[PDB]
Amino acid sequence: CPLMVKVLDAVRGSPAINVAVHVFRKAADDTWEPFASGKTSESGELHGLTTEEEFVEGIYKVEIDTKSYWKALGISPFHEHAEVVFTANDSGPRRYTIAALLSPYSYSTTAVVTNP
Amino acid sequence: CPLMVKVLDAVRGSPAINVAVHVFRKAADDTWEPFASGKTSESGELHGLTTEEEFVEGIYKVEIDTKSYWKALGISPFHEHAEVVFTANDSGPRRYTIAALLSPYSYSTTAVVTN
Amino acid sequence: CPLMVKVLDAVRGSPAINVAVHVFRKAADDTWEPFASGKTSESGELHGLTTEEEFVEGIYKVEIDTKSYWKALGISPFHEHAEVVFTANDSGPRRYTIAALLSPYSYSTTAVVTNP
Amino acid sequence: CPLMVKVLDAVRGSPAINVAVHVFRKAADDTWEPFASGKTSESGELHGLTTEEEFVEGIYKVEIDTKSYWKALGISPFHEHAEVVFTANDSGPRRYTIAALLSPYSYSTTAVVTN
Ligand SMILES: C=CC(=O)Nc1cccc(/C=C/c2cc(C)c(O)c(C)c2)c1
Ligand SMILES: C=CC(=O)Nc1cccc(/C=C/c2cc(C)c(O)c(C)c2)c1
Numbered sequence: 001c002p003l004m005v006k007v008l009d010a011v012r013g014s015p016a017i018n019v020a021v022h023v024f025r026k027a028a029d030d031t032w033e034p035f036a037s038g039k040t041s042e043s044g045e046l047h048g049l050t051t052e053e054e055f056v057e058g059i060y061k062v063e064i065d066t067k068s069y070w071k072a073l074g075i076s077p078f079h080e081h082a083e084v085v086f087t088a089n090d091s092g093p094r095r096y097t098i099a100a101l102l103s104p105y106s107y108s109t110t111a112v113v114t115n116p
Numbered sequence: 117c118p119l120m121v122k123v124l125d126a127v128r129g130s131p132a133i134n135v136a137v138h139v140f141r142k143a144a145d146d147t148w149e150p151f152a153s154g155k156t157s158e159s160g161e162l163h164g165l166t167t168e169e170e171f172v173e174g175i176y177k178v179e180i181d182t183k184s185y186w187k188a189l190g191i192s193p194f195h196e197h198a199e200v201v202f203t204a205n206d207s208g209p210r211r212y213t214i215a216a217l218l219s220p221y222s223y224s225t226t227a228v229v230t231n
Numbered sequence: 232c233p234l235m236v237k238v239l240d241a242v243r244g245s246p247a248i249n250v251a252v253h254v255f256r257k258a259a260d261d262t263w264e265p266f267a268s269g270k271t272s273e274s275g276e277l278h279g280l281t282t283e284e285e286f287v288e289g290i291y292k293v294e295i296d297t298k299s300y301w302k303a304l305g306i307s308p309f310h311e312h313a314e315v316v317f318t319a320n321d322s323g324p325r326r327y328t329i330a331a332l333l334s335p336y337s338y339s340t341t342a343v344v345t346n347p
Numbered sequence: 348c349p350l351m352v353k354v355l356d357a358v359r360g361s362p363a364i365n366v367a368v369h370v371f372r373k374a375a376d377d378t379w380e381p382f383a384s385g386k387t388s389e390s391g392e393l394h395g396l397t398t399e400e401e402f403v404e405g406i407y408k409v410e411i412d413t414k415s416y417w418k419a420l421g422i423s424p425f426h427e428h429a430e431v432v433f434t435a436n437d438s439g440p441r442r443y444t445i446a447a448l449l450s451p452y453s454y455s456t457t458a459v460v461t462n
Contacts, residue, residue: 008330011358013344013425013452059196078227078360080175083199099239101341103450105360106226108339110332111194113221113244127242129309129336129460130440194244209361217457219334221244224455226448229360290427309458311406314430337457342425344452 002055003036003088005046006099007064011075015044016102018072020065023049025058032061057089062098070104078105086111118171119152121162121178122215127191131160132218135185139165142175151176168210177201178214186220194221202227233286234267234319236277237330238295242306246275247333249303251296254280256289263292288320293329301335309336317342349402350383352393352409353446358422362391363449366416370396373406382407399441408432409445417451425452433458 003023007016019040024032036049062084070077084098094113101108119139123132135156140148152165178200186193200214213228234254238247250271255263267280293315301308315329325344332339350370354363366387371379383396409431417424431445444459 008341008343010341010450010453013342015343078202078229080201080203083201085196085199086194087196101339101453103226103357103453105229106224106357106448106450108222108224108332108455110219110222110239110241111244112239112246113194124446124457124459126334126337126457129458131459131461215355217337217455219241219337222241222332222334224339224448226355226357227360228355228362230362309433309460311432311434314432316427316430317425318427334457336460337455339453339455341450341453344425 001047001049002052002093002095003049004095004097005040005049005062005064006097007040007044007046008099008101009044010101010103010106011073015042016040016069016100017042017044019044019046019069021046021049022063022065024061024063026060035060052093055089055093058087059085060088061085064100066100066102066107069102075104079107082107082109084109084111117163117166118168118211119165120211120213121156121165121180122213123156123160123162123180124215124217125160125185126217126219126222131158132156132185132216133158133160134188135160136181137162138179138181140177140179142177148177171204173204173206175201175203180216180218182218182223185218191220195223198223198225200225232278232280233283233324233326234280235326235328236271236280236293236295237328238271238275238277239330239332240275241332241334241337242304246273247271247300247331248273248275250275250277250300252277252280253294253296255292255294257291266291283324286320286324289318290316291319292316295331297331297333297338300333306335310338313338313340315340315342348394348397349399349442350396351442351444352387352396352411353444354387354391354393354411355446355448356391356416357448357450357453362389363387363416363447364389364391365419366391367412368393369410369412371408371410373408379408402435404435404437406432406434411447411449413449413454416449422451426454429454429456431456 009016097112180198217224240247328343411429448455
């Protein structure tokens with residue numbers, strides 16, 4: 001998959017399961033168009049969002065719905081979501097892993113970008 | 117003030133100086149309206165964004181222009197910016213510090229909310 | 232594997248490859264005994280450190296040699312290493328992933344603990 | 348002072364208060380000798396650890412007793428402590444802040460080194 005999302009829970013020491021993720025792409029008119037969405041698995045991973053054909057150059061936003069996640073575990077968290085915004089594929093196709101590590105009042109995010 | 121932003125650089129081990137920061141408040145129509153902005157100081161801090169009177173409950177977005185920061189240092193970064201979106205709630209503590217720790221391909225953010 | 236180590240590079244947006252890792256276990260006399268060691272692969276991962284038989288209860292230290300890593304890439308880093316110290320297997324066998332995300336003056340570490 | 352420690356809590360969004368911190372200096376025989384210690388303040392900070400005269404170049408270890416912190420809050424943590432080991436170098440800036448951001452199964456640490 002050219003775009004994968006991995007989410008971990010820093011309170012539990014576990015994958016963050018059933019986390020909703022929405023991906024948008026910036027359009028020519030500067031609006032954020034819905035691009036793909038899904039939920040993390042029991043491993044904290046979300047694959048199958050897009051294809052190399054569909055995943056063209058652009059500015060992408062990966063919105064991780066952390067508030068909804070924490071509001072199931074009895075924690076009232078600080079953030080509404082964690083948003084990751086980046087230019088993709090502008091030197092040709094790459095594979096992207098967007099990883100996030102969640103706490104109620106904090107998160108960490110990183111990217112792993114590989115050239116197939 | 118009731119809102120402060122602190123930005124640190126994980127590559128150089130220092131404050132992130134002269135970083136542009138824009139704060140937006142979510143309007144009734146679900147658009148982001150400009151609220152406050154500035155550039156971080158030599159200590160990586162931006163104070164004076166708002167007052168207690170203006171900083172009412174609501175959803176706020178703090179956008180940190182990380183891409184320009186890295187580019188000015190001659191380093192190629194991943195993100196367009198770092199986004200921190202949160203609800204201000206009067207039931208909680210009264211002073212909010214949004215802190216961010218920057219790397220070219222990663223960032224960490226936390227909130228320190230005190231009375 | 233009951234003990235895995237994953238290391239990422241926050242400057243490059245890549246796995247951190249060829250990172251030396253030394254694992255110690257606290258002995259009855261309170262000294263740190265060498266337990267296992269290895270290097271991260273091209274995926275940033277180190278598997279094969281131990282077996283479920285060998286990986287008994289104890290206090291373990293996972294030392295990630297971050298300074299040696301950064302001193303190959305032309306960065307003089309801040310830390311000597313990143314050390315992760317934890318009690319393992321004290322409610323029976325678990326599988327542990329120790330993950331670290333490295334920058335020259337900072338690191339993040341987390342654990343993912345699963346019950347097979 | 349030349350050495351400060353700041354500790355934050357990522358679960359509660361606040362300073363980590365009353366956390367024990369021990370600082371060690373590496374001796375010639377490769378053992379860790381006690382150097383300074385204290386407990387973080389209400390602002391999560393520990394100042395007054397050393398002076399410029401005593402804080403010579405060398406390898407130092409800052410051990411943060413995270414396990415006791417979490418246990419006092421009734422939360423089960425992963426780590427025994429958080430360790431930060433570094434070399435003090437006179438060629439670099441003169442003031443070192445060791446910051447740590449704590450969660451039960453994770454921590455982040457950074458160094459802010461300034462003049
Ligand atoms: C409210 C004051 C305040 O936070 N002061 C201060 C001084 C030094 C560091 C910091 C914040 C540090 C920080 C440190 C780490 C390791 C992080 O991952 C993040 C997101 C932030 C704050
Ligand atoms: C149980 C195996 C497992 O979690 N493997 C795995 C695979 C890929 C990434 C990771 C961890 C990523 C990560 C991501 C961030 C933002 C971090 O601050 C830290 C410390 C780690 C772990």
